[PDB]
Amino acid sequence: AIHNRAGQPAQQSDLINVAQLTAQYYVLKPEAGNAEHAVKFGTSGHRGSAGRHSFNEPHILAIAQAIAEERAKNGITGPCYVGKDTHALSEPAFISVLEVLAANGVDVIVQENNGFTPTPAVSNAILVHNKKGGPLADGIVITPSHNPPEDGGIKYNPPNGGPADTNVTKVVEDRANALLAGGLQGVKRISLDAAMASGHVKAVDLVQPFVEGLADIVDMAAIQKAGLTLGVDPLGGSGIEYWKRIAEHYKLNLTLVNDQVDQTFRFMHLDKDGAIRMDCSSECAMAGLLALRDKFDLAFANDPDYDRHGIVTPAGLMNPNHYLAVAINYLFQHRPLWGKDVAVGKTLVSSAMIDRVVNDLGRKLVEVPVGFKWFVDGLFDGSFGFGGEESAGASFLRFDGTPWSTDKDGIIMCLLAAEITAVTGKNPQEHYNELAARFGAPSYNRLQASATSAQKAALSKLSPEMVSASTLAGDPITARLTAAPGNGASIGGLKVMTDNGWFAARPSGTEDAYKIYCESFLGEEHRKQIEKEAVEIVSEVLKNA
């Protein structure tokens, strides 16, 4: 908690003017040659704000044109599923996308009645469509994730249902930027009315198919039989109607603690920095649900795109690493159709509790670099049963070991917590407590140290033998890694291990620093000794550039 009003309900003075911001999307423009206003279309698409000239009509027209061209180049002739979240700027962006796709003769499928669509609902729709074997579908999700009310975002999901990799995003980014530099000479656009009249835009209900299909991934019948008292704070996000339909279709005792949809997100409690941020894993942002935690056996929440999850019990808000370990431990014991050819994905900055759990089950661990992108292909072909990130986003397979969503899915992760509690009689936090009793309770932290550009660059291109330390916090170093053990890919940095702890260091993308992730199975004080030594080691390896 950094801001004096962290954890308190937002005040009127904290709120955006929604109408003014939306107007700014049309009346303000990116400054030509100003890099800060340019399309930066990356792992999570392009994000910005109309009032900062970074999320305006020109950007989205440009991006939508770029996506139409690329998808056609790539032989993608089926429909494009275009979903949006409950951010203000998703409305104007949505319209720009329809105007341009329709003008390019792209068939678009949208949620009827201008509704909202979670990121995994777009992923799921693409996968289900493409399993029918005809022209390929892909998708666009119009969301800046949990970013404050004034922000907008837009991202692309190719036919494998997952987020677009750099081979797609870089091309799209450059084309969008050249289109901007050309004054939107090369953009095909028709009016909203013409687009709707064209026949290219089809409105369907994406909710029912997703909600009904949940029985093929989570044990919905077990949940029903347990008759748990469940709560959810939809956090004004894109899956609010999804939670309603889940409770209704499956006849669950599941209560929405509020049903607000408000583009100022005024019902929110302020995050640690005082921003309105819909972070389902932040205790400050989750203060509203946390105050009701005694009312439910189990409760949860999702960020605006519904790709992440927050799990509440009467003990509080679970730490995301803790829940990942529990999800994995449970899933691989309760999925008979996930045979020996189905492994566990883990990013290398995630808790080593995962390693202990997976070793204990006699399953294969695939350690990958930072980022969900490394799980997409394995989820898609069924070789990864589960892949998650320590920031509270994950996905796992259907019962039969085929994919449900190749993007992150917050709904299945919440429902899985319910299946766990229902099947085992123990909530996921009680599960973690037992793991911690068995393996020790690790202490985990993230920090950062000042670094010059030159240092940051050098950190990315090390090799294991540049690290001459033989010991870390009183234990022999068992590994010096510059590549991920699971897929061999570069980590763009360094990880040092002992039996009792580890650290990893990577250059900060945004600041003159490098980030340090570390963890100890012996506790806080030992973790603190790792931190100290981690800086010493990293200072040593890069003081010569």
**H runs (alpha helix) in 276-345:** 287-290, 320-331
Handedness of CA 268, 270, 275, 280 (dihedral sign): negative
Contacts for 132 with CB less than 8 Å, ≥ 6 apart: none
Q: Which is nearer to a copy of itself, 20 or 539 (CB)?
A: 20
Site size for Mg ion, by CB under 5 A? 6
**Does 145 show up as a binding residue in the annotation?**
yes
307 contact choice in Mg ion, a copy of itself, none (CB below 5 to 8 Å, kind-dependent): Mg ion
193 contact choice in Mg ion, a copy of itself, none (CB below 5 to 8 Å, kind-dependent): a copy of itself
Do residues 274 and 3 lie in contact, with contact meaning Cβ atoms separated by under 8 Å? yes
Please tell me the distance from the alpha carbon of residue 457 to that of residue 459, in angstroms, as a whole number: 6
Window of 195-203, 257-265, 303-311, 421-429 that interacts with Mg ion by CB under 5 A: 303-311
Backbone conformation region of residue 175, classed left if phi is above 0, alpha if psi is from -120 to 50, else beta: alpha
Please tell me the distance from the alpha carbon of residue 104 to that of residue 386, in angstroms, as a whole number: 37
**Does 400 show up as a binding residue in the annotation?**
no
Q: Which of 9, 20, 291, 461 binds a copy of itself (CB under 8 A)?
A: 20
Distances (CA, A) of 476 to 468, 500, 529: 12, 10, 14
| Closest separation in Å from C-beta 190 to a copy of itself | 11
**Does 303 show up as a binding residue in the annotation?**
yes
> How would DSSP label each residue in 61-103?
HHHHHHHHHHHHHTT--S-EEEEE-S-TTHHHHHHHHHHHHHH
The answer to whether 52 contacts a copy of itself (rule: CB under 8 A) is no
Q: Which of 14, 70, 85, 99 binds a copy of itself (CB under 8 A)?
A: 99
For the question of residue 145 being annotated catalytic, the response is: yes
Neighbour count for residue 161 (Cβ, 10 Å): 29
303 contact choice in a copy of itself, Mg ion, none (CB below 5 to 8 Å, kind-dependent): Mg ion
| Closest separation in Å from C-beta 240 to a copy of itself | 9
Q: Which of 15, 215, 466, 469 binds a copy of itself (CB under 8 A)?
A: 15
The answer to whether 390 contacts Mg ion (rule: CB under 5 A) is no
Handedness of CA 533, 374, 64, 141 (dihedral sign): negative
292 contact choice in Mg ion, a copy of itself, none (CB below 5 to 8 Å, kind-dependent): none
The answer to whether 334 contacts a copy of itself (rule: CB under 8 A) is no
The answer to whether 12 contacts a copy of itself (rule: CB under 8 A) is yes
Do you know the residue count of the chain? 545
The answer to whether 18 contacts a copy of itself (rule: CB under 8 A) is yes
Q: Which is nearer to a copy of itself, 16 or 246 (CB)?
A: 16
Q: Which is nearer to a copy of itself, 259 or 434 (CB)?
A: 259
The answer to whether 181 contacts a copy of itself (rule: CB under 8 A) is no
Please tell me the distance from the alpha carbon of residue 169 to that of residue 155, in angstroms, as a whole number: 9
447 contact choice in Mg ion, a copy of itself, none (CB below 5 to 8 Å, kind-dependent): none
Contacts for 62 with CB less than 8 Å, ≥ 6 apart: 39, 175, 176, 177, 179, 180, 184, 187
Q: If we measure between CA atoms, which residue out of 271, 173, 175, 278 comes closest to residue 233?
A: 278
The answer to whether 89 contacts a copy of itself (rule: CB under 8 A) is yes
Site for Mg ion in 163-182 (CB under 5 A): 165
Q: Which of 303, 367, 419, 519 binds Mg ion (CB under 5 A)?
A: 303
92 contact choice in Mg ion, a copy of itself, none (CB below 5 to 8 Å, kind-dependent): a copy of itself
Token pair 């975002």 in the structure block, residue: 153
Neighbour count for residue 449 (Cβ, 10 Å): 16
Please tell me the distance from the alpha carbon of residue 221 to that of residue 14, in angstroms, as a whole number: 43
Q: Which positions are annotated as active-site residues?
A: 145
**Residues of the binding site:** 145, 303, 305, 307
* Site residues for a copy of itself per CB under 8 A: 12, 15, 17-29, 88-92, 95, 99, 114, 191-193, 259-264, 266
**Residues of the binding site for Mg(2+):** 145, 303, 305, 307
